[PDB]
Amino acid sequence: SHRKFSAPRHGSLGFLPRKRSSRHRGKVKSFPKDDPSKPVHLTAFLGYKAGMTHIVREVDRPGSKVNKKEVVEAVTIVETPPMVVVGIVGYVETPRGLRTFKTVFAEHISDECKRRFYKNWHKSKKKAFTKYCKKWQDDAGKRQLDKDFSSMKKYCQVIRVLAHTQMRLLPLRQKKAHLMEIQVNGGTVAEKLDWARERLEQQVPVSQVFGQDEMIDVIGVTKGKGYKGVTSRWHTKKLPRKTHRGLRKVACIGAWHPARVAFSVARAGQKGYHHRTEINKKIYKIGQGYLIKDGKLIKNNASTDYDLSDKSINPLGGFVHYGEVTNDFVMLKGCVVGTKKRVLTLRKSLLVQTKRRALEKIDLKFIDTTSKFGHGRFQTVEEKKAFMGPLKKD
Amino acid sequence: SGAKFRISLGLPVGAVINCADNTGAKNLYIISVKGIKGRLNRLPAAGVGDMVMATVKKGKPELRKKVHPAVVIRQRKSYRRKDGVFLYFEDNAGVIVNNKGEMKGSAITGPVAKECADLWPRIASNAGSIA
Amino acid sequence: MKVELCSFSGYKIYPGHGRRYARTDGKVFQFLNAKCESAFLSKRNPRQINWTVLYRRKHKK
Amino acid sequence: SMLRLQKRLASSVLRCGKKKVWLDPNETNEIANANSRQQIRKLIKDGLIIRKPVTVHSRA
Amino acid sequence: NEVVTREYTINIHKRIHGVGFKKRAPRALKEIRKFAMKEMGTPDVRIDTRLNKAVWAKGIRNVPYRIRVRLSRKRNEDEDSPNKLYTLVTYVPVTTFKNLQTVNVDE
Amino acid sequence: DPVPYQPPFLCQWGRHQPAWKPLM
């Protein structure tokens, strides 16, 4: 007979091959569609989930009950040291798909990018791109390089650029850079290719790609949670206390007569470590790195117009399980996917962003740099030293 | 114009909140909450400023044994205001209030949370202190 | 964002932290953490507890 | 090698438990060829096996 | 250059972390033996009985957080073996583990 | 060795057993 009381279904079947991600770094499944009216630009960037904090800001949306009021907003900080462009690739439009036509690398590729081409960099003799670079210091190889760019002027429809993260700058253990194709969306393909050929072996910072109060797409792999049951992985009802063989189960799988269990029935298995794309993440603030000028460095990242204190966004005792963010960063409203130290693809938004909330401008009043390794209660070190007074170790 | 934000609502159906006005009631037994579509196996729950269907479980005998509409005013479950403060009270409380919002009683003992008092102006006019 | 003080400690609460508490008699209290909340609701005296600001004003530290 | 005959006989000659029999660990090959109660009385007199004292249970 | 004796302090507290109550003093012994295998490449590690008493001084649950250990590589006596050398692991009574570097004690 | 005597059946089916009971 039928189910007595109707109910919605546990889980979504749109995400259903709930397996471990085959990739560690989030793939851009779709780049934004270009128009040649725009100038040439990048459409993606590759950063690292540093941590979380609060923000305090005035809200200007008319009609709300929180108009001209100060909210707090959870934000993520994504440490984004500038990427280095070491290759271009063009894609021809085919009736079977979009085939990669020809890849052209740079002359000087750093050891950071060279780590990626090796499953064991200790044991190896480090021979990658050593015959490729003989194309860049003769006449005949340069003629073939020019003919490759000219052969891409005619036939390529999509031009993507190869960029890697400058991994030396981060607090991470690893020295191996993440490569990534970023679709250059802009004017005509010849102008696009001249522009990317200009940027070869060059730094591309994040203010080049993004801006403040921009809605981005954040692509990455979910924090992994293991082999989990159907009460954790699918959030079904726990069975009553009196059940014999266990209660964190799905009691009825299916009926008798479709004599298979369906794919739509929820079973136990791998929860987390899934690839996701979560959209409409507002860039509250693009931050700046530490930099030295006039001898003494200037580090005041969390300094705002209403704070005017020389603190950086690094909380007390640093970020927990991450380290110190000494580079330029993007600060994103709300939470993003992944664990800490997780490489975190940023994508410009696919959608024509036209709302009241999505076009709101941002002026922050307070970036919270209290300690997150416990209940911190002091914003900076000298505040703590002035409140507590002198200690025994002084 | 400005509407109510959702806050943590920790008074399901079955709660006896006390009655913070001078109708003569002492308890208010919540029998349902006004405005809930529902879902399979959930108690309808109510937070501050929720119109609720109550029952005077002790008090005056003219008030008992019938269903009263009511408004929840204090809750002991902590709820986050939009400026980022978690507020909670010393007890759960409510007042008997008709379907259009008028208070059946005259004065309100204890503070009224402003999540209620912005949304119900007659309760705010009878409110001694707010939040 | 008026930074307020803990009703138990005397520490300076910042706009994200803490938990604000209101009794039925009036008298809204702010706390920095559930250490101080639990110390308040147990009816302990801040002047007898060493790490609070009131103790440290009483004992001239 | 095997000193359970000597520990049993040392327990019965000392008039205590074998909880309290202390066979010397360095002189294992001199206790190992005792194999009787007369030889074990000599090992007691030589001091190779000792009645251990009572574990303290203070009344203080 | 082979026979070396030298002082170490082992933070036992971060090698014993997470293991259950009935397996803290045995695991503390296993990580002292792994420590002696790591700092000196001798698989034959023989740990002294006074250090056994020192680790088991409280119980099987509560094991001391740091311990001071003298780690001595030695030439092997007869019963000639695959291992040419053995490491003896000795116990050093220390009042406080404050500003204690790995001291290379001299013979 | 003592050859084990054939398995000692001590019933459970039948009317006493409340597990697997049919219609009736």
Added chain:
RNA sequence: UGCUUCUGGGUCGGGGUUUCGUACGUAGCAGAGCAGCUGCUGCGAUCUAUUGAAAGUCAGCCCUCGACACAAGGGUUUGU
């Protein structure tokens, strides 16, 4: 993910952070009182000072470049 550009991780130590709440010892004409000697001396929970002290803090916290050794290895396969 890491495994010699005098570099690299590791260990230990030192800082930062943080958790609990003020260690032992000493001192006290502080201590309900009591005992003994002709004010002094013993017993005494507790209190005050030293002392936001003591202790823990990556084992999956944050920076050291202070000590100390180690690290240019071992094995099996793979050809247009």
Added chain:
RNA sequence: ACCCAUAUCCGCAGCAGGUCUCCAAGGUGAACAGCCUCUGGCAUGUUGGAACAAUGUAGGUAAGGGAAGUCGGCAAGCCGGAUCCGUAACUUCGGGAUAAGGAUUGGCUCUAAGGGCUGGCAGCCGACUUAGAACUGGUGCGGACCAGGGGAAUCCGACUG
């Protein structure tokens, strides 16, 4: 002779079952209770190592609400010792009754009361209790262990067995 029982007996076995007695320390406590220890005994119950996934099994803990869960408060939890009050309907006048409901409880320093032997007094001796007071602690004290949830009715059987 020996075993006399989580291995010498009976349970198809070195089987968590069964099987008649004797001896019986210290603390805490009303206690031959539970918990810790000495004498005596033992090696963790037919194996070890490494990790700490789901589902278990056995313990716990949970904000806010409080039986809305379920056939059904099943299970868990509340209460729990002692002392001082206080104790209802009904009754076969025995009970109900630890009814129900309250207060107290630690440590330390004292005070009072409660006796023997010798020659209304004097000396010399020894026991545990009980009551009261001060001071003191972050209101914590039957601090672990031990240890009644209660009330109003209806049916059936008087009861113990």
